Amino acid sequence: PRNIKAARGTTLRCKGWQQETILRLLENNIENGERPEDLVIYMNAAKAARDWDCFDAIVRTLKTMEADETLVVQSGKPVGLFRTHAFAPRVLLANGNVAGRWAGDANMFELEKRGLTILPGMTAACWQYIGSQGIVQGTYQSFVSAAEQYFGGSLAGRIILTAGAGGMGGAQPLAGKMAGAATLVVDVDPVSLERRLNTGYLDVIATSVDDALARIRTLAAEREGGSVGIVGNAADVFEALHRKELRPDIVTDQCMVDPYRGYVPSGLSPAEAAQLVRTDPEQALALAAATLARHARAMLRFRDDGAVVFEYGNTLRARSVAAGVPEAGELPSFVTLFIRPLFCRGIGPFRWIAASGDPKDIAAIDGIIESTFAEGHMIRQWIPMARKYIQFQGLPARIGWLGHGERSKLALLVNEAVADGRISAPIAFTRDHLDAGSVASPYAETEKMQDGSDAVSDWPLLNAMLACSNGASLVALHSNGDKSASAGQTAIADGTPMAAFKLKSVLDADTGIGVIRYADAGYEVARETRALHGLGIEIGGG
Amino acid sequence: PRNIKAARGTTLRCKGWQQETILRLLENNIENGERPEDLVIYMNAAKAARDWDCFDAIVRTLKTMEADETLVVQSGKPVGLFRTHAFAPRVLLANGNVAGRWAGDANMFELEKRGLTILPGMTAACWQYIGSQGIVQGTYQSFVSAAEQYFGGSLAGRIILTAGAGGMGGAQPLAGKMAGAATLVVDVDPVSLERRLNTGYLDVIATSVDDALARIRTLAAEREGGSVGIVGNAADVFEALHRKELRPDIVTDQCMVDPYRGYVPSGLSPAEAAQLVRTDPEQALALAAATLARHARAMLRFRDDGAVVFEYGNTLRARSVAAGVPEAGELPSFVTLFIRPLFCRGIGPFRWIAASGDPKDIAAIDGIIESTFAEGHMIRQWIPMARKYIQFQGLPARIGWLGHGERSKLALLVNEAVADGRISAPIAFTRDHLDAGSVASPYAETEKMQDGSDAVSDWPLLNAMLACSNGASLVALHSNGDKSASAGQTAIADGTPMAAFKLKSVLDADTGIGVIRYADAGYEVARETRALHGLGIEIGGG
Numbered sequence A, B: 001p002r003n004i005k006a007a008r009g010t011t012l013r014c015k016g017w018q019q020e021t022i023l024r025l026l027e028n029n030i031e032n033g034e035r036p037e038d039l040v041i042y043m044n045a046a047k048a049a050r051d052w053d054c055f056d057a058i059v060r061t062l063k064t065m066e067a068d069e070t071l072v073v074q075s076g077k078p079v080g081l082f083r084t085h086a087f088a089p090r091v092l093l094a095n096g097n098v099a100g101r102w103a104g105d106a107n108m109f110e111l112e113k114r115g116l117t118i119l120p121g122m123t124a125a126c127w128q129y130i131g132s133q134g135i136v137q138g139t140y141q142s143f144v145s146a147a148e149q150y151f152g153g154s155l156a157g158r159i160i161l162t163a164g165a166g167g168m169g170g171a172q173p174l175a176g177k178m179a180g181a182a183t184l185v186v187d188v189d190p191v192s193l194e195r196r197l198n199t200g201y202l203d204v205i206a207t208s209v210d211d212a213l214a215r216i217r218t219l220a221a222e223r224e225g226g227s228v229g230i231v232g233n234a235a236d237v238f239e240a241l242h243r244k245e246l247r248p249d250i251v252t253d254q255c256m257v258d259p260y261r262g263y264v265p266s267g268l269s270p271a272e273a274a275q276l277v278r279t280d281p282e283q284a285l286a287l288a289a290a291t292l293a294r295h296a297r298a299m300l301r302f303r304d305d306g307a308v309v310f311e312y313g314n315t316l317r318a319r320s321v322a323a324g325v326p327e328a329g330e331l332p333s334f335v336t337l338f339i340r341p342l343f344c345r346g347i348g349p350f351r352w353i354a355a356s357g358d359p360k361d362i363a364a365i366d367g368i369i370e371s372t373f374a375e376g377h378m379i380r381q382w383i384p385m386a387r388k389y390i391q392f393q394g395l396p397a398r399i400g401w402l403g404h405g406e407r408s409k410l411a412l413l414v415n416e417a418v419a420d421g422r423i424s425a426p427i428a429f430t431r432d433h434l435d436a437g438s439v440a441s442p443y444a445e446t447e448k449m450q451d452g453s454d455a456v457s458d459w460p461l462l463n464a465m466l467a468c469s470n471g472a473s474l475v476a477l478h479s480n481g482d483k484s485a486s487a488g489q490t491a492i493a494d495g496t497p498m499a500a501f502k503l504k505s506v507l508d509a510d511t512g513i514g515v516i517r518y519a520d521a522g523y524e525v526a527r528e529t530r531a532l533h534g535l536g537i538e539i540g541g542g
């Protein structure tokens, strides 16, 4: 038992607070991981570092590096330390990037097996994970937008069905509950439900399908929001819930559907599945695809009854198409129905973390927001909700979606609050990679762009390079094999005037490049936002 | 006729010399382009900007931007201007990057057609092309290493056969001549040979195959180096040169073999080929692949006779394999035979350009080198050769391969020479993208890496991010569809102490990350270089 835990308090182990914050962020990733003794954070096998040896050497370099040197990380392995300057980043990471033609599913698996790459996830290998809370606002925003679009602004009395209680999926049953819906989440692995049940993200774990149906219908009939977990395989349980007439209003899914990493064929356990992939991969893929076709056909069968059925960024439709269900490619997605209007204004999963470990530092910022943004603002209705439902996990932190100009504004107020004692230690500002100007993903975030530019990955590359040029504390470029590319970045509010400058340079360009990206594709709200903030360039013949 | 030409002299059109140098570099790209009225620089269709409108807006932004702002370029289109700081780059470019699964040959063509991407080449869309001279030292180094490995250190009396007299290929007949060999270059387009003939890169253009054979044999019999061009299709001419018993010692090829961009089927002209691709692409590909199979089989037939036959980074083997010649995949390449030992020590196509336009500024640096590096050094034997054979093209410039620590050393001496009047204006230092630590290309530069890491593209991403963090003047990330990713960078020696700092920060990490990349793969010379310069990190369990 390594049992990594982020350091608490205000005593440096590093030569300076930039380094110590990143070290604590690294430790905090592991502390909140789904399988932390394997470095696994989430998405079945996305890791904080390539192995425990690289983890140890990363920790040593953080502790002794100077404020004008920069650590270089190649797929979870520290490979260099360069003398740079004080306004440059302290860490540069590039994880899981493989040239497209050889980044197919099968070869990524082989390269990872041989130790040549890691699967970075989004926030796993760049140390920006804050547990299940980093996901919950986005998923709650989706359920609320769905209630606004299709159910008259209310999920009271409505049924939400979904699967996946993993590191990201586990945020589902709380978001549904916060949204007013009776929410049923299927997971094949009881430990996953047990982890959400104990963390405050699941209300009860049902003992059977019948039991699950009675408890959801009671919530539905009382028109109360609540969460009900079921232990079972989504293929088998989805079909039984249709035979028993659950009649769900909303069906979605956040399973790991990767046959190589996490999708459990019907009849197997998670353990058996992972062993069949190590010893007989071709049978596993045959069994996985067999189970996914039933899984997808069951979701399509709920749609035929009138449920709103969408994908939630896990490649279910495409992988389902590959397994013989071409109708699965005609299902919609959470992005095109709910999130893209937010991205057009640069609104994304902005988050922050108290290196202190003191919950009073988060509550402090919570008061800043309520004194700083107008009532009715998206963020003024989220903070009371987060305060109410969301337990801290590891270093106290907060998810707070904000748009262009608003991120730099809050970050400067927090940097001043640090500078004058209301906050006891530095605040790390970061985000998910799935932000307006930092990801190209044709299966998810950039599906069906107005101008057809789905697969253009120039944008995240520019996002990273801007973050470096602006002085972010840590900058990362990831890939999901041949399907997606994205940029992440961390900027530290430590109280210094140097921090204040970086925070406003970094954050305004972070969202500014997102506004530009969507304006370029033709979205009119983004084009107006770009015109208003001077974000454009005059090009003739237009 | 736009007829772009780089500005000469020492009068600013921009607000500062960082901006004016980049503008002149942009203009210089076009001035030296193979088809400059279409923005085409080289590689059939790689362009300086997406269209003439973006070109004009890029020029306007350069002229009015401040020394603490940064211009952002997305596939040849200016998309943003951000307030950054004085130690950040002035331009960030990301050109031709498309997410892997959709960056296949056919879809890249469609995306370019619809105006959504550009093919950046290496130095075309990031404004680091210095004409055919940027290629000649590398190709001469290959011919000389081949003479050292297989022909006793001499090509006197030896025959070199090859094809492609394009922007890059045109460097071949001069490199062969400089190397002592009788060099025959086939190109299907007489204007290409005429351009090399007039620029000093081709000695004579033959009137027929017979004529070509007589003149090469005369050079061979006099054991003199010389260049002979032939107008014809490589498939037809290679076969005839075998029927007539040319018996070449060395066979290589630098054709554009892309059926979509530049490869001419046998019986067609360049014009007809490009029209058949616009109006009937499926017949063009059938005819191209038919011609390439004969082209490759003819090269293989020279090998069966005992010629040394290698590929030169144009994908001939892979595309030949796709067209039905699987033996073409067993041919070697210039990288694995000649260049990789240089890359292990960070030795790469370092180059520099006089924004002055005054040849006396290049000759000045030429004297610095001869006063600074030991006799017998690679660079002390190249400068007299370059002085002797290489005419200036556009802004006077110089190719000068140098290794780790040597690039920053020369760059600081030039920055001082600028600071004290021996050089009349700033010097722009750059390189090809095909450098040790800045490209992942499994078909070429990273084929058959000792550890199997051919397709790892983390490295160029890190190279770019380092250049930004270190304050390079311009930083670029390109892709060749799904086959390659690479980084470029420009750093300006303008005489300032700020320039001196950036030059040493940028160049040492530029090569330092290249040493690391090859040390990581296991190359012992690179591992020693890394140990010597403190470039590593201690990792346990090793």
Ligand SMILES: NC(=O)c1ccc[n+]([C@@H]2O[C@H](COP(=O)([O-])OP(=O)(O)OC[C@H]3O[C@@H](n4cnc5c(N)ncnc54)[C@H](O)[C@@H]3O)[C@@H](O)[C@H]2O)c1
Binding pocket: A034, A042, A043, A044, A045, A135, A138, A163, A164, A165, A166, A167, A168, A169, A170, A186, A187, A188, A189, A192, A232, A233, A234, A235, A253, A254, A255, A256, A257, A262, A263, A264, A265, A266, A270, A291, A312, A313, A314, A315, A434
């Ligand atoms: N913002 C977003 O776009 C977003 C949000 C949430 C989740 N996701 C996607 O969801 C996927 C998983 O993320 P994660 O971190 O939760 O992974 P995880 O590995 O932590 O959880 C995977 C879960 O699926 C479960 N499960 C697997 N196969 C099953 C099957 N046949 N039937 C029922 N349950 C099964 C596993 O037991 C496991 O608990 C990812 O692909 C992620 O990208 C995306």
Ligand SMILES: NC(=O)c1ccc[n+]([C@@H]2O[C@H](COP(=O)([O-])OP(=O)(O)OC[C@H]3O[C@@H](n4cnc5c(N)ncnc54)[C@H](O)[C@@H]3O)[C@@H](O)[C@H]2O)c1
Binding pocket: B034, B042, B043, B044, B045, B135, B138, B163, B164, B165, B166, B167, B168, B169, B170, B186, B187, B188, B189, B192, B232, B233, B234, B235, B253, B254, B255, B256, B257, B262, B263, B264, B265, B266, B270, B291, B312, B313, B314, B315, B434
């Ligand atoms: N350092 C390196 O690795 C290196 C060096 C030189 C060239 N190259 C490769 O060589 C390719 C071309 O580069 P370029 O800039 O010279 O392109 P280019 O478009 O300027 O020239 C292409 C040439 O091939 C000729 N040609 C085309 N088809 C032919 C055919 N069937 N028969 C005979 N001749 C034919 C065209 O007429 C044209 O002159 C590129 O793919 C480049 O990557 C690589």
